[PDB]
Design an enzyme around this catalytic site. Structure first.
Site, PDB file in Angstrom:
ATOM      1  N   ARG A   1       0.800  -1.237   0.000  1.00 19.45           N
ATOM      2  CA  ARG A   1       0.000   0.000   0.000  1.00 19.45           C
ATOM      3  C   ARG A   1       0.834   1.289   0.000  1.00 19.45           C
ATOM      4  O   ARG A   1       0.343   2.342  -0.418  1.00 19.45           O
ATOM      5  CB  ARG A   1      -1.025  -0.017   1.143  1.00 19.45           C
ATOM      6  CG  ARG A   1      -2.027  -1.149   0.975  1.00 19.45           C
ATOM      7  CD  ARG A   1      -3.238  -1.100   1.903  1.00 19.45           C
ATOM      8  NE  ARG A   1      -3.385  -2.399   2.579  1.00 19.45           N
ATOM      9  CZ  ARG A   1      -3.247  -2.647   3.889  1.00 19.45           C
ATOM     10  NH1 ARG A   1      -3.018  -1.686   4.777  1.00 19.45           N
ATOM     11  NH2 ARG A   1      -3.340  -3.904   4.313  1.00 19.45           N
TER      12      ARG A   1
ATOM     13  N   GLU B   1       2.089 -12.210  13.509  1.00 20.96           N
ATOM     14  CA  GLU B   1       1.336 -13.039  14.470  1.00 20.96           C
ATOM     15  C   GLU B   1       1.959 -14.409  14.785  1.00 20.96           C
ATOM     16  O   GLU B   1       2.452 -14.622  15.896  1.00 20.96           O
ATOM     17  CB  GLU B   1      -0.109 -13.230  13.990  1.00 20.96           C
TER      18      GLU B   1
END
Ligand SMILES: O=P(O)(O)OC[C@H]1N[C@H](COP(=O)(O)O)[C@@H](O)[C@H]1O
Ligand SMILES: O=P(O)(O)OC[C@H]1N[C@H](COP(=O)(O)O)[C@@H](O)[C@H]1O
Ligand SMILES: Nc1ncnc2[nH]cnc12
Lengths: 169, 176
Positions: free
Chosen positions: B67, B104
């Protein structure tokens, strides 16, 4: 278009055996390091579209993740038009259309009847571009053209696509 | 900067429970659909940098995949400076520096090209959002391996409760 294409071709950097043995990689990233060359890349695509579509308003540039993001948004802003991404599966939030090659586009991004150009850095097999085409058709939008920077002719990527194709280099 | 930031904030679209339960996703993609809003995003960052660095030449914008690619190159061209990407592992050709960061349930890796930025270059790192700061921190490590100077991080948004800026050792600007 021709003189700009020559200078942009000279800026490409060749990398043999990437990503694997026997493949010749053409790196277009050196263009973006030089704002003179980058402007020429944008100007060249702008000139092409003005020549190919003089009396057809383009509503959006649709760019493919990831390297289509490097120039697609800049081209859109130069034209005064919107940019919308086609992303890999699970990356875009909200309700999306899907197309297997999996790619996605957001349902709320492009109204039906919109005129679009699909952009990406290179066309190889054509599978990615073809998938993006299917997403555009699910939005009930009009696919005017594919615009690429480079094209691997021997792979016959164009044969998978059912809209016109322009390749700058 | 302030008036542009308000209109850009209104353009953001919130998506609860994406990519998973309990996470609130802020989607900045509606900005890019409108060339008026997109120009305001670019102008706002340009204005900030002119205010923060009036007599320091910026040599490159370094944008994070993916992005950061949506606005970084456009900002670079507006400033009259170079753009260089930081990419996920195995994507960039040629000799690269590497920097690891945790997610994570794993460790992922970022890369930058060795020939892209000369030593002594002044750079700004750009990305859409800072959450944990892990990605931005990794990009910082790549800049230091190039022996380049990291003037600032520029983000569009920032999740304050996550304390992402604490992992970074250069100044941070967040537009919204
Ligand atoms: O690095 P990726 O796996 O995302 O692949 C990117 C490349 N694949 C496409 C071209 O390949 P193909 O679909 O075979 O035409 C382009 O998007 C080009 O940027
Ligand atoms: O593409 P990813 O799944 O790695 O996630 C991208 C997003 N996460 C980063 C922010 O997260 P963090 O590294 O925790 O600050 C941004 O690059 C934002 O674009
Ligand atoms: N809440 C969030 N919205 C969008 N991108 C993110 N990356 C990490 N956290 C995020």
């Amino acid at each position: 278009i021709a003189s700009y294409a020559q200078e942009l071709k000279l800026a490409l950097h060749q990398y043999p055996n990437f990503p694997s043995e026997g493949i010749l990689f053409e790196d277009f990233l050196p263009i973006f390091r030089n704002p003179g060359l980058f402007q020429k890349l944008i100007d060249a695509f702008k000139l092409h579209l003005e020549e190919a579509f003089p009396e057809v308003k383009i509503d959006y540039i649709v760019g493919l993740e990831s390297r289509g993001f490097l120039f697609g948004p800049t081209l859109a802003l130069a034209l005064g038009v919107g940019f919308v991404p086609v992303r890999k599966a699970g990356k875009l939030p909200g309700e999306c259309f899907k197309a297997t090659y999996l790619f996605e586009i957001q349902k709320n991004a492009i109204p039906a009847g919109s005129n679009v150009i699909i952009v990406d850095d290179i066309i190889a097999t054509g599978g990615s571009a073809a998938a993006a085409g299917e997403l555009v058709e699910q939005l009930e939008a009009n696919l005017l053209e594919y615009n690429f920077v480079m094209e691997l002719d021997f792979l016959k990527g164009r044969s998978k696509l059912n809209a016109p194709v322009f390749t700058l280099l």
